[PDB]
Structures are given as structure tokens and as C-alpha cells.
């Protein structure tokens, strides 16, 4: 597949790598989200190292209030990181 | 390697490969979007009428261009389609 198709496939696979670990195999609980951010997004996790700060990030991602981050919420998260980095591209 | 960080870099850079050709260099007009879709997302594709209803849908603020935020909303939706298939 072409680069952007492969990027989409990595978005999907990386989510399930972590969501399937515990409980609802299709949503990220706090431990799963933490492990995804730390392993998979180490360039972008900075301030969120602090536990209260990570829980705040988590409560912002969880827009339907069911205590987990589902795939849509995770895509919105990734889109926010992309929009952050795009500010830097545009200058 | 962090495949998800590589994914993110491709999501940003691919947009700018096309948005710079005409008009606002930070937005895709319909011609630039058709190029991007044809060349970068061929698996997701088509007539010109098809490119137009897709354009309409992506351009959620009705300014006749697809901006970076609209493009990320689109890519989220395509990932969601693939995810729904993955889940079964």
C-alpha cells in the first residue's frame, strides 16, 4: 500500500495492540492509554508524565464520559497531534 | 521505531505535497484533493461527480477548499471505516 494507506493501517493496528489487553478489547482504559502514549508516542508525551496531568489528558480525550478512550476519541487525539505538528510545518 | 509517529509524519507531509500547487498553499482545492486521493489513497476510490460529492462532504465550512483540520477529520473517518471492518 501507499504511505498514507499504511499510516491509516498503523493507526488502527496500534490502537488494538493496546485496547485488547484488558477488559473491553475495543477501548483503551487508563493503563492501556498510558502504555500506548509512552511506547508509541514518546516524542509527544512530555507534561503528561505527571499522573494528574495524564488523568487530565485522559478526561479531555474521553468526550462521551464512559471512562475509556474508544477508537473515534483516539483518532481525534491523533488529529490534534497532527494539527499541533502542522502549525510548525506552516510557520 | 515508533510506527505511529511515522504515521503522523506522513499524515502531515502528504497534505502539503498537494495543497501547495494552486491558490492558498495551505488548503486543497478540488483539483488538489482529487490528486491527493488518486495518488495517495487509491484503495478508497471514480467519476468527476463522485469527486464532487466527496469534496462537498469534506469541505464542512463550505469555503470550497479542504483545510488541514478538515483533512484530519476525513482521515479519522477513513481509519474508522477500516476499524469497523477490523472489529467484525
Amino acid at each position: 500500500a501507499c504511505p498514507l494507506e499504511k499510516a491509516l493501517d498503523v493507526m488502527v493496528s496500534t490502537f488494538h495492540k493496546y485496547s485488547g489487553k484488558e477488559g473491553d478489547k475495543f477501548k483503551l482504559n487508563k493503563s492501556e492509554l498510558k502504555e500506548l502514549l509512552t511506547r508509541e508516542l514518546p516524542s509527544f508525551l512530555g507534561k503528561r508524565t505527571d499522573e494528574a496531568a495524564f488523568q487530565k489528558l485522559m478526561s479531555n480525550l474521553d468526550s462521551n464520559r464512559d471512562n475509556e478512550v474508544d477508537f473515534q476519541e483516539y483518532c481525534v487525539f491523533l488529529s490534534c497531534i497532527a494539527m499541533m505538528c502542522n502549525e510548525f510545518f506552516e510557520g | 521505531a515508533c510506527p505511529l509517529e511515522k504515521a503522523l509524519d506522513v499524515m502531515v507531509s502528504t497534505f502539503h505535497k498537494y495543497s501547495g500547487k494552486e491558490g492558498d498553499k495551505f488548503k486543497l482545492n478540488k483539483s488538489e484533493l482529487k490528486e491527493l486521493l488518486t495518488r495517495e489513497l487509491p484503495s478508497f476510490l471514480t467519476d468527476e461527480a463522485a469527486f464532487q460529492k466527496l469534496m462537498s462532504n469534506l469541505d464542512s465550512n463550505r469555503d470550497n477548499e479542504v483545510d488541514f483540520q478538515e483533512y484530519c477529520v476525513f482521515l479519522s473517518c477513513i481509519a474508522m471505516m477500516c476499524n469497523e471492518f477490523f472489529e467484525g
Binding site: Q72, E73, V76, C80 | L54, N57, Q69, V73, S76
Partner: peptide, 14 residues
């Protein structure tokens, strides 16, 4: 999010 809302809007259109 405005973004979550926008994703839901578009997904229902595509």
C-alpha cells in the same frame, strides 16, 4: 470536542 462532533458529522455522510 468540536473535532469529535465534526468526525461524527462526516462519518454519517460518507
Amino acid at each position: 470536542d468540536a473535532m469529535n462532533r465534526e468526525v461524527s458529522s462526516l462519518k454519517n455522510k460518507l
